[model samples]
Each structure stands twice: as structure tokens, then as C-alpha cells.
Target chain A: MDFYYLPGSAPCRAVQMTAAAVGVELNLKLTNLMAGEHMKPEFLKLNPQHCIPTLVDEDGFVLWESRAIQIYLVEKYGAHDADLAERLYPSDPRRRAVVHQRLFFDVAVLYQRFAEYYYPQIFGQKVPVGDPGRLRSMEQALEFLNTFLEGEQYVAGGDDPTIADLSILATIATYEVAGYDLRRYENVQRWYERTSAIVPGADKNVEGAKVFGRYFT
Target chain B: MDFYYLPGSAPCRAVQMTAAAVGVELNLKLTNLMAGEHMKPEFLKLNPQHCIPTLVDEDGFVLWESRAIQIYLVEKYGAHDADLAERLYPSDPRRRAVVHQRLFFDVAVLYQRFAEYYYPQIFGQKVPVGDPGRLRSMEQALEFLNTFLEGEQYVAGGDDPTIADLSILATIATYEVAGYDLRRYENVQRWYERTSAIVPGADKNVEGAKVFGRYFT
Candidate 1:
């Protein structure tokens, strides 16, 4: 499998962590956004969205969208150990639906709010980031997540870490990069620390997250 | 099954259409956003995010996120008809992943741009709606969708329509409410008309979309 990615991107890191969890080795192909490699004709042909991390399997089937790729990898490869596959991404429709809900929460609400508040700041544009209204939305996202995590060990109420955990973990780390105080969200902070310790590929994710931290900080 | 929804919401309509296709009758509970019903304590307790359409099965399992709900309904209930279920949400991992990618595109790209452009206008905020740069992003989303549909009969390359098509069709209809021209996207326009013609529950969708259109127009 060939994976096109950039180290500092949260979605790219999420895919890498998922690959690590499933023990699937990917041939990493760097598609540097800063260098405008994503806009190249070849890359555009591969993925019209021209985003990463884009995955191309050996047979030339291509896919993008980190959450989609994460689940696909687990469903295809993690099936080797039925127990592991269920824990990583449960086959039961209800369990899987919860995982899917959390994944969408990351994309549509949590990370989205993160980008809304921080992207302009990162790009050196004048925008309000620390304002109460903006911070409330971010905090509300965390609050909802905290409630989801209250009695559960993982975000999806599963005992074992799933791809949903990995996806949210990567985005939460980016919030840290932007200097957000996750400690304010008790459940979120606790879950973050626990997942950071137990999930596979922690070292690689931490290293990449810090690279983003340095750039943002 | 109990479904919490607002008729004019694109996501809610997507879920409704998916239910109609699968032959599941949902006991609809209208959550009026205009009256702040979604913000009420009772609804908030059911879903902390307090968004529709939320689903509660007879067994007390609650699921939100419209795409997740759509798939869950099909997987759990639509399994009675294996062929129909497969076509609506393919069982093949790769095909399913492609459907998922399109669903994400709807939430994060296509509909996200629509909200960014029109939500402000709806609220009477002085924001850039028709501005060149913002309009370009909306058009670009369509361009990507058009490219995806260039040779496929359905959004996910299936012979029959999938949840992804329903999801996109709902959002695309909302763009009509906003008065954006769909004709410029040749493939998209063709697919839109075709899906409108064949998808089950489209008549109901047309009625709901017209309600939205009347308000926006």
C-alpha cells in the first residue's frame, strides 16, 4: 500500500496510527502541501480533492478521507484476529454506529471548531480565537465528548481502543499544539492520557504532534 | 423506532429517505429548532450535542449523526433483504469505503461550504455569500463531485443508489434553495436529476425541499 501524507497533518497521523494498530506497513509517500505537491496533476488525478493522506492499494483502488481509510484498514486487515477486529472496530451495528458517530464528531464538530478558531491564527490572519463565544463552542464540543467518556473507558464506550479513538486522539493533540487547556475537560484529559499510553504507535504520533506544536507555538 | 428530526434539515431528510428505502417506519418526533426545542433539557439529555435527527431504537439504543443512523438502519433492519442492503450500502469493504468517502465529502466539503455561505445570510448577518473566493470553494466542491460521478451510475460506483447518493442529494437540493446554479456541473446535474427520479421517498423530499426553498427564496 502506498500512503501519501504530511507529518504535521492530524488526519495523516491518524491513518499512520491506524496502520500501526493493525500491523499493516505502508509505503509512505510524502505529499508536501507547503511545496504545493498536492495540487500537482498526478495527485489531482489520484484524488480530485487533492488531500492527504490518500491511500492506493496494490490493485490501484484509491481512497481518501482519514476516517474512511482507518475503518477500511481495520475491516480488511484486522480481521486476521477476530477479537482484535471487534475491539478495534466492532462488527455489531450498534457498537459500530457509536464509533461512527464519534468519528463524525471529530470531523464535523471538534476538529472543525479547532480549525475555525486556530487556522486563521496559524495563517497569520487577524481573527478572534480566545474570545468567549468561540471558546464556548470549543468547550461545548469538549463537554459533549466528556459526557460521552464519563462512564466509558473509550470514546465509543468500548473497552479496547478503536479507530474512533485514534482519529479523535490525533485531533486532540492538535488542540494541544494550539495551546488549548485540555485539563479543563476532565474526562477528555483523562482519556487522552490513557489512550496516549496504551494505543499502538504512540511514539510516532507524539513526535509528529510535537512537530506541529513547535510550528504553531 | 423513534426519530427526532426537523423536516427542512438536509441531514434529517437523508435519514428519512434512507428509512423509506429500507421500509422502516420511524415514529417521528419533531424537534423544532426555531422554538429552541433542541436546546431543551429533555432533548439535551437524550443527545448531549442536541442535534437531529437522533434515533432511539425500541431497546433504548440511541444513535445520532445522520449518516451513521442511515447505515445503522440498513445494517440492522435492511438485512432482511440482503440484495437491497448490499446495493444501498455495499458489503464489500472497498466499495463501502468509497461510499463513506462520499458521505464525508457531503458533510465536510459540500454541505460545509453551503452552511458557510448561506447560514449567515439566513441569520441576516453581513457575511460574504456571493463573494468570488467563497463561491469558488462551493463550485470547487461541485467540481469534485462531478468528477467522482463522471463514469459511475451512483456516487459510490454502484449500479443502484447508496446512502451516499441520498446524503449528497439532500444537500444539493438545499443549494437550489440558496439559488446557486447547478447547471454548471454537467455530471452532477445529470446525476441529481436521475437520482431524484428513482430514489424512494423522493416525493417527500421534494415537499420538504420546497418548504426550505420558499423560506430561502
Candidate 2:
């Protein structure tokens, strides 16, 4: 499979972690957003949205949206090792629902607020520093994650890490790049450390995050 | 099943459509956001996020995030009519992945952009009107949807409508409530009409949308 990606994108990094965990080798293709490479006509033909982390299967099926790609990888290849795949993404309807909920939370609430606060400033737009409302929204999102991790060993109440963890972990690391103090949310911090230690391909996420940090630095 | 919802919410209405489509009867419980019911201690105990379209299955499994709920209803109850359920959600890995992509796009990209442009105004905050950058983002999000629907009968490229279409259709209707001109994107308009006719509970969406529209009107 060919995985088109930007090193600094949290979604891309999360997909990388899922691929590693599932033991799938993705032929990575860097699509440089800085150079407008993703917008090239050839790339646009593969994905009209021209977003990175677009995947092309050997049979020529194309898919994008990192969380969806994560699920697909696990569903398709994790079957090779059914036990591991089910643990990562359970087949039980209720268990899988929680995982999907967390994925949606990461996309819709957590990362959405993070981007709103930082993207403007990163793009050199006139968004003021220390905007309490935006920062509070970010904190509220984190608080929900902290609460979610209160009793469960992992997000989604799974016994083992799932793609949901990978997705959230990637976003949390990016929030750290934005210089938000992770210490404020103890459960999130604890889960983040535990996930980093247990999950494969997490260290690569650290370097990928540093690339993202350069924008603010 | 207990469904906590507000009449005006697009996500809630989408869930209604899915329930109708799959023939699952939801015991609707109004959690009135306008009346601060969502913030009540009891509701918060059920869902920490305190958002509606929350579901409590007969077995006491509580779930939120509407798209996740939509999928759960289908995967759990749609089993009785397996053929219809599979068409609505599809069991094929590649096909299901596409459905999920559109769902993510709806929450993270489409509705996210819509909220950014209008939520502050709805909350009586001093957000300025016609902010070119934010409006451009909304337009770009719509354009992506337009592109996704080009020559396709559905957003996920399926022969029949899936949960992805219902989810996107609900959001698109809410966008109409925001008074944005839908005419600029011909494909989105066309697909919106097509989806509206075929999805079982879409008329509820139109009435539900009117409730949303009243907020701005």
C-alpha cells in the first residue's frame, strides 16, 4: 500500500502507529504541504480533497481520513492475527462503539478546538494570545479525555490499546507542541505515558511532533 | 432505548433517521439545551460531555457522539433485516471505510467549519461578521463535499445510500438553516436532494432543521 503523508500531521502520524501495531508495511510517500505538492494535478486525481495520509491499496482502492484508514488497516490486516486486531478494535458492538466515539471526539472536539486556537496564529493571522475562551474550550476537551481515562486502562475502556488511543495520543502530543501543559490533566498524562511505552511506533511520533512544533518555535 | 436529544440538533435528527431506517424504536427524552437541561447533574452523570443524542441501550450501555450512535443502532438492530442493514452500513471493508470517511468529514470538516462561522453569533459573542478566512474555510469544506459527489449517486460511492449519506444530509440541511447559499455547489445540491428523498427519516430532518433555523431567524 502507498501511504501519502505529511510528517508533521497528527492524523498521518497516528496512521503510522496503527500500521506499525498491525504489522503492515506502508510505502510512505511524502506530500509536502509547504510546497503545494499535494495540490498537484496527479495527486488531486487520486484524492480530490488532496489530503495526505491518503491510502492506495495494491488493487487500486483509494481511501483517506486517517481514523477511517486506521480502522480499515486493522479490519483488513489485523485479521491476519485475529486476537490482536479484535483487542485493538473489538468486534463487539458496544466495545467498538466506544472506540468510534473516541475517534469522533478526537476529530470533532479535541483536535478541532486545538486547531482553532493555534492555526490562526500559526498562519500569522491576527488572533490574540491567551484567548481565554478558546483555551477553555481546549481545556474542556482535555477534561473529557481525563474523565474517560479515569477507570479504564485505556481510552474506550479496552483492556489493551486501540486505534482510538493512537489517534488521541497523536493529538495530545501535538497539543504539547503547542505548549499546552499536559500535567493539568493527570489521567490523560498517565494514559499518554502508558500508551507511549506499550504501543509500537510511538517514538517516531515524538520526532514527527517536533516537526510540527517548528511552526511555533 | 433512551435517546436524549433536542429537536433542533442535526446530529440528533440524523440518529432519528438511522433509527427509522433500521426500524429501531427510540424512547426519546428531550434534553433541552436552551433550558440548561444538558448541564443538569443527572445528564452529566450519564454523559460527561453533556451533549445530546446520547443513547442508553436496553442493556445499560451508554453512548454518545451521534454518528457513533447511528452505526451502533444499525450494527445492533439492523441485524433483523440484514440485507437492508448492510446496504445502509455495508460489510465490505473498502466500502465501509468510505462511509466512515464521509462521517469524519461531516463532523471534523463540514460541521466544524459551520460552527466556527456561526456559533459565536448564536451565543451572542462579539464575533465579527464576514471574516473572509473563516468563510473561505466553510466554502472549501463545501467544495470538497461537492467534489466527493461528482458523478456519484452517494457520498460514499455506494450503489445505495449508507449512514454516511444520512449523516452528511442532516448537516447539509443545518447549513441551509445558517442561510448560506447552497446553489454555489451544484453537485452537493444535487446529492442533497437525492439523499433527502431516499433516506427514511429525512422529513423529520426538515422539520428538525426548522427548529434550528428559528435560532438564527
Candidate 3:
């Protein structure tokens, strides 16, 4: 199996972490989005949009989008850890519903805020600093996550690492690298610590921080 | 059961059409984004994102995100048609992966394109009509969908009309309303007609045409 990735994309990190947790050995190849590597012919042939964290199986079936990749891997290779897969994406109707809700919020709303607020500040693209309207939306999104985590150990269901945990972890870590203030949300701060201790190679809050030492320094 | 939606929302229409196809009566309630009805305290308590297509069951357990709601309805209510639900969102790992990819692509990339082009036009947000960078990205995404749909009876597999079909159907339809002709992509045009005829009450497209017509006329 092969995984295409960008170092700091939340979706990419989620895929990487899930693969690690499920013991799926993936041949990781880095794509340089900044250099327009994803848009060029070679990568586009493999993945049309050139989003990072695409997985190509041996049969050459290519799948993009991080959440989908995680689901696919879990479905195909998760039998050995069936219970774990169920925990991450509960097969029960109600539990899975909430997880999916958080997933949509992360990818659509939260991820957008990260891009809107941090993308410009980090990447020199003549982007706007922020919009109060947009920021208010984002804070409310965090508040929801924080509210979900109020008495729980993990974001979706208490402390058992699910896809929600990976998503939340990846988003916060990426934003932190981009210099977003972490001190504001105490619940998220506590959740962050719980997430960093999750599964092994995937929990790279420290490593991601160290990687961007100069820029986020 | 109640379906909270906005006519213009592609995801919501995907579920609405599915509900109609299976002969399910979804009490449709339209949420006004302009009035911030979705962002109100009452709605946020249900689904924090303040987005539409929030559906509630008799027990009041809420499910948001159109695709997820489709699956929930299928699991709980559409069990007699398990075969049909499987076809829309197949149980097989490989085929389901394709559906997931296409669904997220619709939600993330295509939706982004629709928003960029249409938001300013409709909302009078004062954003420029064309940003070369944004347009290029949107076209690249369209090309991806077109390539995937090449000569297939339907997207997930050959002519099954899965959730992916509903998603792409609604998304492409919106772009059509935006004066972007989908006829340029032969495969997509083919798939659109194939699914549209089979989907029940998809003629609601005519009834809901008022949303776009109201915006323009």
C-alpha cells in the first residue's frame, strides 16, 4: 500500500495515524503542494485533485480524502482488530451518527477555519488575516468540540481513540504549528494531551512542533 | 421523521431524493440561512455546525450530514430494502471506498467551487467573479469527476445509483443552475440522466427551482 501525504495537513495526519494504529504498512510518499506538485500531470494521473494522503492499493485503485482512506483501510484490513475498528467507527446506528457529524464539522467547518485563519498567516499568499464573522463561526465550532469533550475523555465517546480523536488532534496540531493560541480552550487543551498519548507514531504533537521549530519558534 | 434542509443544499437534496425513492415521508422543514435560523440556539443544540439537512427521529436522536443520514435511515427504516441501500452505498470495501471518495470530493472540493462562484453572485458579498487560481482548482476537480464517470453507467459501479450518484447529481445540477453547462462532460451528463430518471420525486427539482429562481428573478 502507498500513502501520499503533506507534512502538515490535518487530513493527512489522520490517515497516517489510522494506518499506524491498524498496523497497516504504507509506503509514504510526500507531495509538495506548495510547489504545485499535486497539480502536475504525474500526480494528477494518480489522484486528479492531488490532495495529500491518497492511498493506492496493489490493484492500482486510488482513493483520496483522508476520512475515506481511513474507512477503506479499516474495512479492508481492520478484521484483525474488528473491535478497534468498531470503536473508531461504531457500527451501531446512533454512535456512528455522532462520529460522522463531528467528521463533517472537522473537514468542512473546522478545517476551513484552520485554512482561513492560519493558511494566510503561515503561507505568504496575500490572504486576509481573519473575518470576525468567520472567526465567530470557528470559535463556536471549537466550543462544540469542547462541549462534546466536557466530561468525556475523547471527543466523540469517552477515551477510546476513534476517528474523531485523530481528526481533532490533527486540526489542533496543524493550527498550533501555524501559531494559533492553544491556551484559550482548556477542555481542548486537556483533550490535546489525551490525544498525543494515543497510538504510537501518529501522535506527533511534539514532533510536528519540533519540525516547524523555526517558523513556529 | 423530520428533514431540516435548504433547497439549494446539494447534500440535503441527495437525502430528500433518497427518502422519496424509498417512499419514506420525511417531514421537510426549510432552514433559513439568511435569517441565521440554523445558527440559532435551538438549532445549535441539535447539531452544532449550524448547517442544514439535520434530520430528527421519533426519539429525537439527531443525524446531520446528508450521507450519514441516508445510511441511518437505511439501517433503521430501509432494512427491507437492504439490497437497495447496499447498492447505493455498497457493503463491499472497494466499491464503498469509491463512494466515500466521491462524496467527500463533492462536499469539500466541488462545494468549495460552487460557493466561490455562486456565493458572491447571490449574496452580493462583493467578491470578484473570477479568481484564476480558484477557477483552475475548480476545473481540476470537475475533471476528476468527469474522468471517474467516463463511460460508467453510474459512478460507484456500473449503473447502481448509489449515494455517490445522489451527491454528484445534486452538485452538478447546482452548477448547471449557475450557468455552468455540464453538457461539456459527456460521461457526467450521461450519469446524471441515468440516476435522475430512477430517483423518486427527483422532480422536486422543479418545485425547489424557486430557490434559485428567486435569487435571480
Candidate 4:
């Protein structure tokens, strides 16, 4: 599979973690976001959205949105083994629904608030102090994530990690690298540590996240 | 199923469309968002995130995030007949991936940007002119949606409308009802009209969207 991404992108790293977990090797094709490479006409022709972390499967299938790509990777690889299908994205409608919910929550709430609170500064605006409303929203997003993790070991599944965990791991990692104290939400804190220890490509996700810290800091 | 929602919410309408399409009758339980009913202690316990369009299956599985609920309904009903699975939610990996990508796009980009552009005004901010940066982002989001609809009759699948079609239909209907000129994006305009005319529960979607129009206008 060909993955076009910038390492610092949380969504891209989420895709990486999913691919690694699914045993699919990604041929990383670095797309320079800082240079506005994604905006070029030819690039836009490939993905009209011109977003990073676009995945092109060997069969010429094109997809973007990290969570969708993660789902694609798992669902595609699920064809490889029946047991593996039940691992990350369960066949059970209810179990899979919860995983999907968390993925949506990560993008819509958790990561959305984080980006609103921090992106202006990351993009070179001088924000000495964050906006209070944005900060409150971001914290509430994390609090909701903590609520999801209260008793479940994984975000949705019981024994093993799902794509929801990988997706949020990338977001939480970016948040952690930005120097926010993850300890404020105990369940989220524990889950972050536990996931980082077990998920595949953990080191790479960390390295990619550190690059974000370089900007977010 | 018990569905807690406000008709004005696009996400809520998306779930309604999906449920109607999949032959599931929801026992509508209205939650008053204007009075902060979603923030009640008991509501928070039911869904820690406490967002509306929250569905509690008869089996006691609680799911929120409208896209997830849409997928859940389709998947659950797919069990009723295998032939139905190929419609709203496809079984083929590539086809299903594209549908999922559009769902993610609706939440993460298209509708997210729309909300960012309009919610401030709806929430009582007196603004004669919008922020230039925010307006640009919102237009770009719609542009991407138009690009996706370029050739396909449906947003993703051919002939039959997928959940992606329903999801984006809910979004674009709100934009239309809010008095935005849909002619701005020709492809989006065509798909929105085609979808609103054919999809199940679409009139309900329009009625719900008018409620949003009352606030947005």
C-alpha cells in the first residue's frame, strides 16, 4: 500500500499504527505539507480534499480520512484470517458500533477541540495564552474520552485493542507531546500508557508525535 | 430502539434517515438541548458524552455519534436479509471503504466546517461579516464535497444511495434551508436534489432542516 503523509500528522500516524497492526507494510511517501504540496493541481486531482494520510491500495483504490483508512486496512486484512476479523473491528454489530462511535468521537470531539485550541499557534499566530472557551472545550473532550475508558480496557473491546484505540492513541500522543498533562483524566492517562506499550509501531508513533511537539510546543 | 434527539440537529436527522431506510422504528425520546437536557446528571450517566441522536438498543447497547448509529442500523438490519447489505452499506471492502470515507468527510470536514461557519451566529453572536479565514475553510469543505459528487449518481455507490448519500444529504439540506445558494457547487446541488427526492425519510429531513434554518437565518 502507498501512504502519502507527513509524519507529524496525527491522522497519518493513526493509519500507520493500523497498517502495522494489520501486518500490512506501507510504502511511506512523504508529502510536504509545509511546502503546500498538497495544494498543487496534480495532488488535488488525486485527492480533491488534498489532505494528508491519503492511502492508495495496490489495486488502485484511493481513500483518505485516517479512521476510514484504518477501517479499510482492518477490513481488508480481516479477509486474511477469521480470528483477526474479530480483533480490531468485530463482526458483532453492537461491538463494531461502539468502535465506530469512539472513532467519530475522537475526530469530532477530542481532536477537533485540540486543533481549535492549538492550531493557530502551531501555524505561527502568537497565542501567548489559549482562549478560555477553547481550552474548556478541549478539556471536556478529554473528559469524555476518559469516561469511555472507565472500565473497558480497550476503548470498545475488552481484551484487545481496536482501531478506536489506535486512532485515539495518535490524538492523545499529539496532545501529550504538546505538553498537556494527560494525568488530569485518570482513565485516559492509564489507557494512553497501556496502549503505547502494546500497540505495534509504538516507537514510530512516538517519533512522529515528537515532530508535532516541535511545532505544538 | 430508543432514540434521543432534537430535530434541528443534522446528525440526528441523518440517523433518522438511516433508521427509516433500514426498516427500524425508533421510539422517539426527545431531549431538550435548548434547556441543556443533554447535560443532566442522569443523561450523562446514560451517555457520558451526553450528545443527542443517542440510541439505546433493546439489548441495552448504547451508541451515539450519528454516523455510527447509521452504520449500526444498517448492519443490524443486514442480518434481516443478505440482499439488503449491498445497498446502504456494501459488503465489498473497496466500496464500503469509500462509503466510510464519505461519512468521515461529512463529519470531519463538510459539516464540521459548516458548523464552524454558522454556529456562532446561531448561538447569538452578532456578526455582520464572517471571519475571512473561517469562510474560506467552509467553502473549501463544500468544494471537496462537490468534487466527490462529480460523476457518481450517488455520493459513492452507483444507482443506489448509500448511507454516505443520506449523511451528506442531511448536511447539504441544512445548508440549503439556511438560505445558502446551493448553485455555488453544481455537483453538490445535483446530488442534494436527487437524494432529497428519493431517499426515505427525506421530507422529514427537510422539515428538521427548516428548524435549523429558523436558527441559522
RMSD of each: 1.4, 1.4, 2.5, 1.3
Q: Give the alpha carbon lDDT tens digit for every residue of B23-94 in model 3.
A: 689988888786689878988898776667899889998888887787676666766787777766688888
Docking outcome class, model 1:
high
DockQ, computed on Cα atoms, for candidate 2: 0.90
- DockQ winner: 2
lDDT of 4 by residue, B126-176 (tens): 566477778889998888888888887988866799999999899989888
Candidate 1 lDDT at B179 equals 81
Chain B alone vs. reference chain B, TM-score for every model = 0.95, 0.96, 0.90, 0.96
DockQ of each: 0.83, 0.90, 0.66, 0.89
Quote the lDDT for A201 in model 4.
88
The reply for model 2, stretches above 4 Å from the true place, is A126-128, B126-129
Better of 2 and 4 by lDDT: 2
The DockQ assigned to candidate 4 is 0.89
Q: Rank the candidates by DockQ, best first.
A: 2, 4, 1, 3
Model 1 reaches what TM-score against the true structure? Answer: 0.97
lDDT of 2 by residue, B1-217 (tens): 9999988899999999999999988899888776688788888888989987899989878999999999999999997898988899998899999999999999988988887778766756746565777789999999999999889999999799999999988999999887988989999988888789878988899899989988676
Misplaced by over 4 Å in model 4 are none
Interface RMSD of 4: 0.8
Clash number for each model:
0, 0, 3, 0
* Per-residue lDDT of candidate 3, residues A27-140 (tens digit): 878877768878889788998667787889999988888888888878888757888788777788888767776776778777777676655554677455666766776777
